[PDB]
Design an enzyme around this catalytic site. Sequence first.
Site, PDB file in Angstrom:
ATOM      1  N   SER A 122      -1.023   1.456   3.780  1.00 55.35           N
ATOM      2  CA  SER A 122      -0.591   0.610   4.932  1.00 55.35           C
ATOM      3  C   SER A 122      -2.350  -0.624   4.311  1.00 55.35           C
ATOM      4  CB  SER A 122      -0.890   0.652   6.846  1.00 55.35           C
ATOM      5  OG  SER A 122      -2.177   0.460   6.964  1.00 55.35           O
ATOM      6  N   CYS A 151       0.551  -0.803   0.046  1.00 53.62           N
ATOM      7  CA  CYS A 151      -0.001  -0.029  -0.090  1.00 53.62           C
ATOM      8  C   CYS A 151       1.195   0.811   0.334  1.00 53.62           C
ATOM      9  CB  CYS A 151      -0.767   0.464   0.928  1.00 53.62           C
ATOM     10  SG  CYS A 151      -1.874   1.232   1.747  1.00 53.62           S
TER      11      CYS A 151
END
Lengths: 212, 197
Positions: B105, B101
């Site tokens: 995240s 990502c």
Amino acid sequence: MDGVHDLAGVQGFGKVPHTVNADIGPTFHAEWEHLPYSLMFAGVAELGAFSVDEVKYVVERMEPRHYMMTPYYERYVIGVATLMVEKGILTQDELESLAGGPFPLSRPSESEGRPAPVETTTFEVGQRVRVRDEYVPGHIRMPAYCRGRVGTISHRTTEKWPFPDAIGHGRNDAGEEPTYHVKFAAEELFGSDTDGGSVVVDLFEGYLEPAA
Amino acid sequence: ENAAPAQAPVSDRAWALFRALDGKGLVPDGYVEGWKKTFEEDFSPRRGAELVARAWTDPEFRQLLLTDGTAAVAQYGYLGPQGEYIVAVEDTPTLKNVIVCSLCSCTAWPILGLPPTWYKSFEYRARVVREPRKVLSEMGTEIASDIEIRVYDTTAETRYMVLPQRPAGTEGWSQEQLQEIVTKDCLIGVAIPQVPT
Ligand SMILES: [Cl-]
Ligand SMILES: [Cl-]
Ligand SMILES: [Cl-]
Ligand SMILES: [Cl-]
Ligand SMILES: [Fe+3]
Ligand SMILES: [Mg+2]
Ligand SMILES: [Mg+2]
């Protein structure tokens, strides 16, 4: 928002701090670290005060130097606190009084956001698409490395979701769109300066157009 | 110039946010403690490992996992927050997949566990999409040049898991034996399953 959080392709960082299968330790490394995600879910699910997209955006809105020196879970403490103040739930005064000191927040938004696009295309697997060459000052789920670039559709989702650029600002006009797995050749994104093969980005319909 | 802002200790700030909300009746009894327990004990890469081991030993399930990951995961009851629309991506003799990502995240929490610190690092977020072969090499995984690397950037609601190739030397192993060698890093895509000597 062309913020410092849009890190893909930035050069100059060192080694990833891990070797495969090394011990990562417990899920939480300190007794507070479960609070930001828990309180995020309270805000989304219990209070109805904000969406997950608004949480992504408020972390994007940290002052850039502040973002860069703040550990991950602390950024979400700051971000959830900021939303609670913005939405009128809490005050900064009370947060600082309870904390016993300073509790600087994310910066105010510089954009009201934008609606789900009215004109979009349903793409099919195998079709060539270009990422629309647009600049969005508020929230967007398009990393800059793919802006204006051409790739091919690998998947169209069977579900649809609110457009981030609207719901990330709490707007009423986010609609719903599917997303597309768009496969780019590494050389489309980084020319000769890459050692990879391909990159697949999961892009809202409203970020795409037919390729020339 | 460029100095950090003054801040109270982070633990004091995090618990101040909890108490400000809790003291207004906005946080149900046991709420954050229940999420802590879910994050620590339920969301786990042991689940993704179970899914991989089943796919390796059951061709029909493998096909389902690769075509309708959500349905496959739902058979096991492992859908959940940050893990509602699942796509499994197949490694092959000529393709190695890796997940990131870059923007934050995003991770398939229920079947991978919450992301490790390194996955959320600026180093990983910046570098793996541009130089995945060097990143993986530095992390201890050599991907030969005859293998295309494909990086999935988790930018919307799809949540990914890698289905690694099954290594030689595991023929006839039980699902339990197989599960043991499918690690968190194998599901993220930075490691290949290892078979002992
Ligand atoms: Cl603490
Ligand atoms: Cl070049
Ligand atoms: Cl279009
Ligand atoms: Cl780590
Ligand atoms: Fe993320
Ligand atoms: Mg940028
Ligand atoms: Mg076999």
